[PDB]
Amino acid sequence: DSTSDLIPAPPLSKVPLQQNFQDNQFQGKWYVVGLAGNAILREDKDPQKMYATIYELKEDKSYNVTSVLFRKKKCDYWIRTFVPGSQPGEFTLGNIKSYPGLTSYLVRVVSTNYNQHAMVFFKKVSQNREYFKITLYGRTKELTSELKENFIRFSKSLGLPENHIVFPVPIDQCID
Ligand SMILES: O=C(NCCCN(CCCCN(CCCNC(=O)c1cccc(=O)n1O)C(=O)c1cccc(=O)n1O)C(=O)c1cccc(=O)n1O)c1cccc(=O)n1O
Ligand SMILES: [La+3]
């Protein structure tokens, strides 16, 4: 029982796909240097801490994806599987049945140079509500003003206001 009001997910026609996606070069550790989405809210009481996501390419060409977060003085690990979709750089969540209320989960790599930065679009339908987010990944915990401005411009092109765009604060715990 609830009421919720969400910015509509953009059509996938507004979400570019990285041309010539190289699955092997996308592997390894990425820091989440920016987050934007219809359920992302800027919060000054506890500013969002940086977390890291590790992509491991399996023999079957799916990714094992592990996120590491620092929560309540401990390292929290979330492991899931990204299964190759219709085109290189697109994925769906493996074993969708195992997530209560989840009916769809889509991943699209928008842009990357593999060795510094990536932007990744996520869309999911959970309890019949449609959520989307854009993750700005860095190989380091800092990125240039130009890459952050490009991320803001792309996020606003998908209908997100300033207060749905956050830059998690770098930490050392868990993600080094
Ligand atoms: O709107 C989105 N995200 C921003 C709000 C995050 N949040 C704020 C506290 C969440 C803290 N955790 C979650 C870590 C553990 N999670 C899970 O065991 C999990 C199970 C099933 C589906 C799923 O998605 N997760 O994460 C993250 O920091 C975290 C790290 C890495 C990847 C990641 O995805 N998350 O969230 C939410 O509670 C939330 C609200 C609405 C939808 C939603 O999926 N989540 O997690 C969104 C849109 C489209 C796809 C998508 O996956 N997400 O998250
Ligand atoms: La999530």
Author numbering: 2 to 177
Paper text:
The mammalian protein, siderocalin (Scn), binds siderophores and their ferric complexes as part of the innate immune system, and has also been shown to selectively bind a diverse range of Ln- and An-siderophore complexes. Scn is capable of specific, tight binding to a wide variety of metals complexes with natural and synthetic siderophores. In general, the binding of ligands/complexes in the protein calyx is driven by electrostatic and cation–π interactions, particularly by interactions between side chains and ligand aryl groups. Although perfected to accommodate hexadentate ligands like enterobactin in three pockets within the calyx, siderocalin manages to bind octadentate structures like HOPO by distorting the coordination environment of the calyx only mildly.
Crystals of the ternary LaIII–HOPO–Scn complex were also characterized for direct comparison between the +3 La/Ac metal centers. When compared to the structure of LaIII–HOPO–Scn that also crystallized in the P41212 space group with a resolution of 2.0 Å, the average La–OHOPO distance was 2.5(2) Å, which is nearly identical to the average La–OH2O bond length [2.55(5) Å] in the [LaIII(H2O)9]CF3SO3H solid-state structure. The most noteworthy structural rearrangement in the AcIII complex involves the movement of two aryl groups of the HOPO chelator, the one occupying Pocket #3 and the other extending out of the calyx, above another HOPO group, in Pocket #1 (red arrows). These movements displace the two aryl groups outwards, likely to accommodate the larger AcIII ion, and are not observed in the corresponding LaIII structure. We can speculate that the larger size of actinium (AcIII ionic radius = 1.065 A¨, CN = 6)28 enables closer interactions between the metal complex and key amino acids in the protein calyx, which are observed at longer distances in the lanthanum system (LaIII ionic radius = 1.032 A¨, CN = 6). For example, the two lysine residues (K125, K134) that define Pocket #1 have an average Ac···NζK125 distance of 4.0(4) Å vs. 4.5(1) Å for La···NζK125 and an average Ac···NζK134 distance of 3.9(1) Å vs. 4.5(1) Å for La···NζK134. Meanwhile, these results emphasize differences in the coordination behavior of lanthanum and actinium and collectively illustrate an example wherein the use of a non-radiological surrogate as a proxy for the radioactive ion did not fully capture their chemical complexities.
